[PDB]
Amino acid sequence: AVKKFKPYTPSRRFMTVADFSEITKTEPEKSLVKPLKKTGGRNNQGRITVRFRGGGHKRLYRIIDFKRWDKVGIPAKVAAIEYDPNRSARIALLHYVDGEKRYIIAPDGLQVGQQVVAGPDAPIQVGNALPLRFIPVGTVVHAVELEPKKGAKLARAAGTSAQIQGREGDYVILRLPSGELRKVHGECYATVGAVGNADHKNIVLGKAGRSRWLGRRPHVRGAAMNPVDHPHGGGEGRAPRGRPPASPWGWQTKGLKTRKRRKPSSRFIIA
Amino acid sequence: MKRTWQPNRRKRAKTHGFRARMRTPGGRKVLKRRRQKGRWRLTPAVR
RNA sequence: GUGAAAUGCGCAGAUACCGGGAGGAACGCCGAUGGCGAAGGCAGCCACCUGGUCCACCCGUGACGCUGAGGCGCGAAAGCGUG
RNA sequence: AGCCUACGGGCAGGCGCCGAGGGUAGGGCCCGUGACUGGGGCGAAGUCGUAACAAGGUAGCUGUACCGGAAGGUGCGGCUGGA
RNA sequence: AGUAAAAAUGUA
RNA sequence: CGCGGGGUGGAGCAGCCUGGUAGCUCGUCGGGCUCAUAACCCGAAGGUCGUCGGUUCAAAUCCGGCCCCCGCAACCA
RNA sequence: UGGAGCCAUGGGGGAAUCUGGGCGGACCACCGCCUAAGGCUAAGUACUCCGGGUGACCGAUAGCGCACCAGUACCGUGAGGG
RNA sequence: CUGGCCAGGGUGAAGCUGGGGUGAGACCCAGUGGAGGCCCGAACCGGUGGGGGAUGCAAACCCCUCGGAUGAGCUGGGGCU
RNA sequence: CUACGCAAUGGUCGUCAGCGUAGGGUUAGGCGGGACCUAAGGUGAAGCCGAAAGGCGUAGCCGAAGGGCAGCCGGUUAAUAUUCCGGCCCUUCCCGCAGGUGCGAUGGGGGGACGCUCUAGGCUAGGGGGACCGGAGCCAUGGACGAGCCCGGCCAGAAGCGCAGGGUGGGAGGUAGGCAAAUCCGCCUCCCAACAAGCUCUGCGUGGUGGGGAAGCCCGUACGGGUGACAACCCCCCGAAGCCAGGGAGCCAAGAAAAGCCUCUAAGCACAACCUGCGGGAACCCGUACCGCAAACCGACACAGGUGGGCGGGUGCAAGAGCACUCAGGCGCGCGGGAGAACCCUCGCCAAGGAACUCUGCAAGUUGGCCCCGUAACUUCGGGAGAAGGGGUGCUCCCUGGGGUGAUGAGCCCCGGGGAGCCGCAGUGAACAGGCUCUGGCGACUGUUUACCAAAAACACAGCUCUCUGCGAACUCGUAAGAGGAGGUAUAGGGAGCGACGCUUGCCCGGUGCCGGAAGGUCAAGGGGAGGGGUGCAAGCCCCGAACCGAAGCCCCGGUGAACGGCGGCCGUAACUAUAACGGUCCUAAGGUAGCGAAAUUCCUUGUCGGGUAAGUUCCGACCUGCACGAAAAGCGUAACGACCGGAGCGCUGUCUCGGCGAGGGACCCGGUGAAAUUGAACUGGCCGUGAAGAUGCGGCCUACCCGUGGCAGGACGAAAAGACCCCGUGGA
RNA sequence: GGUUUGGCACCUCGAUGUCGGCUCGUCGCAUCCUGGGGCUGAAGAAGGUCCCAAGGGUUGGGCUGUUCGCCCAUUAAAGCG
Ligand SMILES: [Mg+2]
Ligand SMILES: [Mg+2]
Ligand SMILES: [Mg+2]
Ligand SMILES: [Mg+2]
Ligand SMILES: [Mg+2]
Ligand SMILES: [Mg+2]
Ligand SMILES: [Mg+2]
Ligand SMILES: [Mg+2]
Ligand SMILES: [Mg+2]
Ligand SMILES: [Mg+2]
Ligand SMILES: [Mg+2]
Ligand SMILES: [Mg+2]
Ligand SMILES: [Mg+2]
Ligand SMILES: [Mg+2]
Ligand SMILES: [Mg+2]
Ligand SMILES: [Mg+2]
Ligand SMILES: [Mg+2]
Ligand SMILES: [Mg+2]
Ligand SMILES: [Mg+2]
Ligand SMILES: [Mg+2]
Ligand SMILES: [Mg+2]
Ligand SMILES: [Mg+2]
Ligand SMILES: [Mg+2]
Ligand SMILES: [Mg+2]
Ligand SMILES: [Mg+2]
Ligand SMILES: [Mg+2]
Ligand SMILES: [Mg+2]
Ligand SMILES: [Mg+2]
Ligand SMILES: [Mg+2]
Ligand SMILES: [Mg+2]
Ligand SMILES: [Mg+2]
Ligand SMILES: [Mg+2]
Ligand SMILES: [Mg+2]
Ligand SMILES: [Mg+2]
Ligand SMILES: [Mg+2]
Ligand SMILES: [Mg+2]
Ligand SMILES: [Mg+2]
Ligand SMILES: [Mg+2]
Ligand SMILES: [Mg+2]
Ligand SMILES: [Mg+2]
Ligand SMILES: [Mg+2]
Ligand SMILES: [Mg+2]
Ligand SMILES: [Mg+2]
Ligand SMILES: [Mg+2]
Ligand SMILES: [Mg+2]
Ligand SMILES: [Mg+2]
Ligand SMILES: [Mg+2]
Ligand SMILES: [Mg+2]
Ligand SMILES: [Mg+2]
Ligand SMILES: [Mg+2]
Ligand SMILES: [Mg+2]
Ligand SMILES: [Mg+2]
Ligand SMILES: [Mg+2]
Ligand SMILES: [Mg+2]
Ligand SMILES: [Mg+2]
Ligand SMILES: [Mg+2]
Ligand SMILES: [Mg+2]
Ligand SMILES: [Mg+2]
Ligand SMILES: [Mg+2]
Ligand SMILES: [Mg+2]
Ligand SMILES: [Mg+2]
Ligand SMILES: [Mg+2]
Ligand SMILES: [Mg+2]
Ligand SMILES: [Mg+2]
Ligand SMILES: [Mg+2]
Ligand SMILES: [Mg+2]
Ligand SMILES: [Mg+2]
Ligand SMILES: [Mg+2]
Ligand SMILES: [Mg+2]
Ligand SMILES: [Mg+2]
Ligand SMILES: [Mg+2]
Ligand SMILES: [Mg+2]
Ligand SMILES: [Mg+2]
Ligand SMILES: [Mg+2]
Ligand SMILES: [Mg+2]
Ligand SMILES: [Mg+2]
Ligand SMILES: [Mg+2]
Ligand SMILES: [Mg+2]
Ligand SMILES: [Mg+2]
Ligand SMILES: [Mg+2]
Ligand SMILES: [Mg+2]
Ligand SMILES: [Mg+2]
Ligand SMILES: [Mg+2]
Ligand SMILES: [Mg+2]
Ligand SMILES: [Mg+2]
Ligand SMILES: [Mg+2]
Ligand SMILES: [Mg+2]
Ligand SMILES: [Mg+2]
Ligand SMILES: [Mg+2]
Ligand SMILES: [Mg+2]
Ligand SMILES: [Mg+2]
Ligand SMILES: [Mg+2]
Ligand SMILES: [Mg+2]
Ligand SMILES: [Mg+2]
Ligand SMILES: [Mg+2]
Ligand SMILES: [Mg+2]
Ligand SMILES: [Mg+2]
Ligand SMILES: [Mg+2]
Ligand SMILES: [Mg+2]
Ligand SMILES: [Mg+2]
Ligand SMILES: [Mg+2]
Ligand SMILES: [Mg+2]
Ligand SMILES: [Mg+2]
Ligand SMILES: [Mg+2]
Ligand SMILES: [Mg+2]
Ligand SMILES: [Mg+2]
Ligand SMILES: [Mg+2]
Ligand SMILES: [Mg+2]
Ligand SMILES: [Mg+2]
Ligand SMILES: [Mg+2]
Ligand SMILES: [Mg+2]
Ligand SMILES: [Mg+2]
Ligand SMILES: [Mg+2]
Ligand SMILES: [Mg+2]
Ligand SMILES: [Mg+2]
Ligand SMILES: [Mg+2]
Ligand SMILES: [Mg+2]
Ligand SMILES: [Mg+2]
Ligand SMILES: [Mg+2]
Ligand SMILES: [Mg+2]
Ligand SMILES: [Mg+2]
Ligand SMILES: [Mg+2]
Ligand SMILES: [Mg+2]
Ligand SMILES: [Mg+2]
Ligand SMILES: [Mg+2]
Ligand SMILES: [Mg+2]
Ligand SMILES: [Mg+2]
Ligand SMILES: [Mg+2]
Ligand SMILES: [Mg+2]
Ligand SMILES: [Mg+2]
Ligand SMILES: [Mg+2]
Ligand SMILES: [Mg+2]
Ligand SMILES: [Mg+2]
Ligand SMILES: [Mg+2]
Ligand SMILES: [Mg+2]
Ligand SMILES: [Mg+2]
Ligand SMILES: [Mg+2]
Ligand SMILES: [Mg+2]
Ligand SMILES: [Mg+2]
Ligand SMILES: [Mg+2]
Ligand SMILES: [Mg+2]
Ligand SMILES: [Mg+2]
Ligand SMILES: [Mg+2]
Ligand SMILES: [Mg+2]
Ligand SMILES: [Mg+2]
Ligand SMILES: [Mg+2]
Ligand SMILES: [Mg+2]
Ligand SMILES: [Mg+2]
Ligand SMILES: [Mg+2]
Ligand SMILES: [Mg+2]
Ligand SMILES: [Mg+2]
Ligand SMILES: [Mg+2]
Ligand SMILES: [Mg+2]
Ligand SMILES: [Mg+2]
Ligand SMILES: [Mg+2]
Ligand SMILES: [Mg+2]
Ligand SMILES: [Mg+2]
Ligand SMILES: [Mg+2]
Ligand SMILES: [Mg+2]
Ligand SMILES: [Mg+2]
Ligand SMILES: [Mg+2]
Ligand SMILES: [Mg+2]
Ligand SMILES: [Mg+2]
Ligand SMILES: [Mg+2]
Ligand SMILES: [Mg+2]
Ligand SMILES: [Mg+2]
Ligand SMILES: [Mg+2]
């Protein structure tokens, strides 16, 4: 719903926070699955490779199940839904009957108690994972594999989701969150429903910290630096680029396409 | 004001230590260079 | 395409025809000097939820009525905010 | 610390409350005035078009929105006070 | 098979 | 003032480079249409090519001299 | 880059066993040299930490940085300077 | 990566609770509550204006003054470029 | 630490010392490290990569103020002590005995285990009183033999007890999971039990008992020793930020790991073995002096600087780690002694005036705490607010209301309320302790920055838009392997500009960029070889070489502005004049819209009017002929915020008219110690003149006894720095 | 004449600090006052103009960094170098 605050301090007049109603009945992670020290650090061996990262609240990684074919036919009651500092989404802790339990990117609609499962069979209803092919051409689904037995990799950000457009061979056509039309395999699992917490896109950070709390350092504009730093740099008295919108490395940043030309992944796309 | 030198034994040994000098070929040369020269301490003395 | 034209579209294969798919909006005939609602206004079909309205029986209450400054709700279209 | 006494006491006198009024500060209501600017009223002489009244030569009018030297044009819906 | 082009302005 | 662009019928532009030919639009004058005036139609007239000199057989045209119009520039102290 | 062979080889193609195969400065024909795609081999040659011998070499601001308890004192985080 | 520190005041958000309100509401009052790159101001961090200092106490200092002071805060130790 | 010492070191002195010579001095199963654990990271079997050198890298290994682990109170030394000693209390290993039990991991599970802010109830630390307890003593100087003054009224302590809390359901079935191997976890099912109890675990109180135990007086160099009493060792009150601790509540940014430690079982092995007792043995290595906000550390120095954690008492002030004084404890800053100049520094006051000072109220003053009334425009309804502007404030006595502790009564604390009355110039009587308001500009705001001349209108910022990226993502680093991105997946990640919020953001794809275009044009290697050449008697062996087929790119076609960017000229025309709504014409890709406008932009320029002043190149309001605004290098606004830059008032002032006096530190004199830049040599005057054009040094003339000391700053083209400007160099970056 | 703007480039680039103000002055006379004086289109008062003459005087504010100006209120005058 997004909570709002009276303006009793600027930087909090617009600030808004997500309505943590859904999570409820569990805030402290599952000391069993999750208990994974997440490694923080904004670069590789030595040098920083992604500018402006670092700082920002401590964080424990909740290990989740991105491939459901593990326990086919084995059902599981959705025990709870919790907060996961590692994604836009929320996650549902579910207890499989095997006794074993794991985490799943909590879809919009999921209710605690509501039992669910995955398999070729499985009732076509939110929370159940089935090979794309065994799914009603139309129904919306999220957490989609891209290649059989390779794990879920599509539509996992709060409220994202893909829709089945149709079939064609061993493949099925998906309209991905971005809007591109791709031909995913049939054997590619995918759990029915949309990602949920769709309210996410609506939070207003508010201050400059908060942006810090999320580990995102300040971003200094090219034209502010000098010739040596960025190409937009230099210029006595603020100026305007000098043509034509480029990045610190040299490439243009307005328009110029990037994806590998002759990539074999093409010819499976159309948008 | 705080000056450039802020003594710290662990640091000193770990940085210019005999062991350290031996790991890198560049360091090995330093050692060689010194011995060749006739220094009394190949490495910074520090107990 | 018009009064006639021109812009524009098409020999990179348009217009015209057939097959396939996507998507959005609107619901032809029925349809009317018709119906419903307090007003604005309401049209494919199905279901669920629901308001008002009319007829017959004279069964019940027993003047419990009418209007209504203010208040309150509704209120075409265009317009504004967020997605 | 005086003055009369009939020594209880009264008087003068001193202190304080309130207090006209003066002073400081901050407000409220009304009036005059002000470089410049916004429309409005009437104009016996000007400039530009011609919007509306006869399909007024694109029915008109209208709430709204946008745009235009101006009247006004066009969009969405509405009215007949048009056919 | 009768919806259908343009053509302003002017009183001594 | 220093490099550079320009003055051609009444207005606004060609023509100059590739010297011997002054073109275009509006306006002005004559006649129509109209009751009338615009518009519309038909027909005409109108230019020292800034100025003084030079080259040449001939100069708006090419060469220097001034007259003005417009545009850059006039920086380090 | 030249008329550019010879010797080596990253890439592609890809033989022959003496009627075999390379070379003699493109390339041909002559004439002639030599036997690739396995390996080894003293001596004559280089240098001077070390020992000795000399010197129209220095003689303590010279001569090695050091004639002396010097790569020390001292300086530098350090390499290093000295 | 792991530890530590932030005197004492001030203001008084959302929530709760109770009353009012309506058909149910929105909402409105109190009391509670203790939010915030909130306020004042030490430590701690900083370095605004002025003066002094200028072979200095000091190769950046001293005094007065001033800014932040629960945060994008300050800080020790162990690390990496 | 001690004994001898004083050359040098010490800014003087020096018998002293951190100095010289010598001798001592550092004692641990429990404190801290290691024979424990893991973090970032390092290393690194395997494995990948790399011209060599090397670079990655799973497990493992290293890596600690983090986790884990058993010592408290006293006493002694010249110098060490949780280390030696005394009392009290623990910990492991090993062997033995006894009694228990399926014992047993490098494996399984649990646990260890975690944020921020706010917090409850108890405790202790610490502190304050006491008429009570113990104790030498003391009546001074006018008064007091006094409930007088003065000093001390604690520490540790096993079991056992009490008091606070912390943890925790007990059963019995199944069981497809915990890379099943489990009686353990985990899941389903159901007799039971409960906002518990029971069982455990800390803290605190108590505890056999063991220590400690002043003031003053006597000895006394030193340091300390009897004294001291058989000392007392009790009662209330205040009370943590610490403990009980893994307590509670709220919140979003969602808060290490591993071992120890429980338990489950596998091999194994049960004459094992582990478990609880109880005896007796065993228990290593390293550190321990001393300095430690500093004279012992970093700053060449005994340097006014820098340096992390804990304790840090009392009274008063609303609070407090603030301010004043002061305990304990530590110091008086390792040159002194006199003077009583100018001048400098720091500091106090000042007649009348009160910003006239000046670039500028720069500096300084004013104001200041708290309680109480009382407060404007504007506003995003939070704020503006401490707006402003006022009143109160000490002490005395009387009356009176709550709360905490008790016990509902009492003292003891904690907040109040109303009366009278007292003295000063003055009551936050000293110290800490805002001056205010009006109006502009820029930026929204807290924040960041040029360590050492710039703190800002600059960067950042939430937020807006464009663009890329479908995941072995784009992108970044790397030769690569690999890594970041991300153990993320378009509500996400990269790049770019703008920069809260409000109203908005026009027109121009000609040129440039990017995006789309299976056509054409052009296009390399290569394919193809018409045709030609060199040689051979030749078969041949060699060379060139036209057609034509041949990518990307460019061309061409089209799109695109919150992509780079651009967004006109000349004439004419309306009742006086003006001006031009209107028109003509040339050019363009299209000719700048709204809104602003002598502005952080306006040259002319102090434009022209208004306002404000006695007077206003600034400031504010207007007008627009805008040299040279203008919409995301955003346009115009905006409450709040600002050590930002401007203009005004009020307040108050030594800024000033205009200076005066006073204080302290220097300066000055004496004793001690004793530098520096600079320096061709000097026996170094003025004026006119001359000279390389500004002379103590030449000419003429003038003046002038030799030498100092305190002062001033005109000259010695005074010092300093082989001029940053300028030019030159076929100089550099 | 040597106070402006310049011209030339002679000393100085192993450095001659380069506007304005303040403090402190000092000199020139081509005199702004004040003292003498000649003409006058000098009635008087007041001026104009030239001559002699620096001895001493030559104000305080607004604006601007300003010099300079302009302005306010004065003055015997508000001199120039
Ligand atoms: Mg690494
Ligand atoms: Mg930025
Ligand atoms: Mg810059
Ligand atoms: Mg760089
Ligand atoms: Mg560029
Ligand atoms: Mg560049
Ligand atoms: Mg500029
Ligand atoms: Mg640039
Ligand atoms: Mg140093
Ligand atoms: Mg260390
Ligand atoms: Mg040796
Ligand atoms: Mg076809
Ligand atoms: Mg019905
Ligand atoms: Mg009845
Ligand atoms: Mg609508
Ligand atoms: Mg709009
Ligand atoms: Mg809308
Ligand atoms: Mg929309
Ligand atoms: Mg009164
Ligand atoms: Mg008025
Ligand atoms: Mg009017
Ligand atoms: Mg007229
Ligand atoms: Mg009309
Ligand atoms: Mg009409
Ligand atoms: Mg309309
Ligand atoms: Mg239109
Ligand atoms: Mg209509
Ligand atoms: Mg007319
Ligand atoms: Mg008429
Ligand atoms: Mg002409
Ligand atoms: Mg005519
Ligand atoms: Mg006509
Ligand atoms: Mg230049
Ligand atoms: Mg080869
Ligand atoms: Mg080959
Ligand atoms: Mg053979
Ligand atoms: Mg060969
Ligand atoms: Mg050959
Ligand atoms: Mg040969
Ligand atoms: Mg040959
Ligand atoms: Mg040969
Ligand atoms: Mg051989
Ligand atoms: Mg061989
Ligand atoms: Mg050999
Ligand atoms: Mg030899
Ligand atoms: Mg020598
Ligand atoms: Mg000698
Ligand atoms: Mg030698
Ligand atoms: Mg030597
Ligand atoms: Mg050193
Ligand atoms: Mg050293
Ligand atoms: Mg409340
Ligand atoms: Mg704050
Ligand atoms: Mg503060
Ligand atoms: Mg303050
Ligand atoms: Mg502290
Ligand atoms: Mg800083
Ligand atoms: Mg400081
Ligand atoms: Mg300062
Ligand atoms: Mg500064
Ligand atoms: Mg200073
Ligand atoms: Mg100074
Ligand atoms: Mg402060
Ligand atoms: Mg740190
Ligand atoms: Mg370190
Ligand atoms: Mg002695
Ligand atoms: Mg001495
Ligand atoms: Mg000694
Ligand atoms: Mg270890
Ligand atoms: Mg380990
Ligand atoms: Mg590790
Ligand atoms: Mg390695
Ligand atoms: Mg440790
Ligand atoms: Mg520890
Ligand atoms: Mg000691
Ligand atoms: Mg002991
Ligand atoms: Mg067992
Ligand atoms: Mg675990
Ligand atoms: Mg006591
Ligand atoms: Mg007496
Ligand atoms: Mg006790
Ligand atoms: Mg507490
Ligand atoms: Mg381990
Ligand atoms: Mg051992
Ligand atoms: Mg010690
Ligand atoms: Mg200090
Ligand atoms: Mg400390
Ligand atoms: Mg000293
Ligand atoms: Mg010091
Ligand atoms: Mg510091
Ligand atoms: Mg400190
Ligand atoms: Mg106190
Ligand atoms: Mg106080
Ligand atoms: Mg203090
Ligand atoms: Mg003392
Ligand atoms: Mg005074
Ligand atoms: Mg006075
Ligand atoms: Mg005054
Ligand atoms: Mg002034
Ligand atoms: Mg002045
Ligand atoms: Mg000041
Ligand atoms: Mg304010
Ligand atoms: Mg204000
Ligand atoms: Mg008193
Ligand atoms: Mg108590
Ligand atoms: Mg105070
Ligand atoms: Mg204050
Ligand atoms: Mg303005
Ligand atoms: Mg301004
Ligand atoms: Mg700012
Ligand atoms: Mg700086
Ligand atoms: Mg600042
Ligand atoms: Mg915005
Ligand atoms: Mg490569
Ligand atoms: Mg990852
Ligand atoms: Mg981004
Ligand atoms: Mg993005
Ligand atoms: Mg900007
Ligand atoms: Mg336009
Ligand atoms: Mg364009
Ligand atoms: Mg284009
Ligand atoms: Mg185009
Ligand atoms: Mg293209
Ligand atoms: Mg070819
Ligand atoms: Mg041939
Ligand atoms: Mg091509
Ligand atoms: Mg005319
Ligand atoms: Mg006229
Ligand atoms: Mg413009
Ligand atoms: Mg405009
Ligand atoms: Mg002005
Ligand atoms: Mg401008
Ligand atoms: Mg101007
Ligand atoms: Mg100007
Ligand atoms: Mg005025
Ligand atoms: Mg003023
Ligand atoms: Mg004015
Ligand atoms: Mg002023
Ligand atoms: Mg203005
Ligand atoms: Mg601009
Ligand atoms: Mg735009
Ligand atoms: Mg722009
Ligand atoms: Mg802006
Ligand atoms: Mg503005
Ligand atoms: Mg500020
Ligand atoms: Mg700030
Ligand atoms: Mg201001
Ligand atoms: Mg004195
Ligand atoms: Mg002396
Ligand atoms: Mg001379
Ligand atoms: Mg001589
Ligand atoms: Mg002379
Ligand atoms: Mg002297
Ligand atoms: Mg002096
Ligand atoms: Mg001088
Ligand atoms: Mg000099
Ligand atoms: Mg030079
Ligand atoms: Mg420089
Ligand atoms: Mg001169
Ligand atoms: Mg001159
Ligand atoms: Mg010269
Ligand atoms: Mg010459
Ligand atoms: Mg020079
Ligand atoms: Mg010199
Ligand atoms: Mg003078
Ligand atoms: Mg004279
Ligand atoms: Mg007279």
Give CA–CA dist A140/A222, Å, rounded: 41
Angle at A97 between CA A95 and CA A103, to 5 degrees: 25
Distance A232 CA to I359 C1' (A): 39
Give the SS3 label for residue B44.
coil
**A145's tokens:** 């594999």
Bridge partners for A43 per DSSP: A48
Contact at 8 Å (CB) between A77 and A94? yes
Q: What is the 3-state secondary structure (H, E, C) of chain A?
A: CCEECCCCCCCCCCCEECCCCCCCCCCCCCCCCCCEECCCCCECCCCECCCCECCCCCCEECCECCCHHHHECCEEEEEEEECCCCCCCCEEEEEECCCCEEEEECCCCCCCCCEEEECCCCCCCCCCECCHHHCCCCCEEEEEECCCCCCEEECCCCCCCEEEEEEECEEEEEECCCCCEEEEECCCCEEECCCCCCCHHHCCCCCCCCCCCCCECCCCCCCCCCCCCCCCCCCCCCCCCCCCCECCCCCECCCCCCCCCCCCCCCCCCC
Flag residues 146-185 of A with CB < 7 Å from strand I: 146-147, 150, 153-160, 176-180, 182
Does residue B26 reach within 7 angstroms of strand G, measured from its CB?
Answer: no
**A219's tokens:** 């971003």
How many residues make up chain A in this entry? Answer: 271
Does residue A47 reach within 7 angstroms of strand I, measured from its CB?
Answer: yes
What is the CA(A196)–ligand 94 centre distance, in A?
A: 60
Does residue B3 reach within 7 angstroms of strand G, measured from its CB?
Answer: no
Rg (CA), chain B: 12
Assign residue A247 a region (left: φ > 0; alpha: ψ between -120 and 50; beta: otherwise).
Answer: beta
Flag residues 188-207 of A with CB < 7 Å from strand C: 201-202
Bridge partners for A185 per DSSP: A171
Bridge partners for A117 per DSSP: A75
Distance B20 CA to I56 C1' (A): 20
Give CA–CA dist A247/A235, Å, rounded: 17
Q: Which amino acid is at A51?
A: R
Rg (CA), chain A: 22
Give the SS3 label for residue B31.
helix
Give the method used. Answer: X-ray
Residue in A7, A60, A10 with CA at minimum distance from that of residue A33: A60
Residue in A33, A34, A122 with CA at minimum distance from that of residue A75: A122
What is the CA(B10)–ligand 87 centre distance, in A?
A: 23
Bridge partners for A95 per DSSP: A77, A101
What is the CA(A229)–ligand 156 centre distance, in A?
A: 43
CA dihedral A154, A156, A158, A162 (to 10 degrees): 30
CA dihedral A85, A86, A88, A92 (to 10 degrees): -80
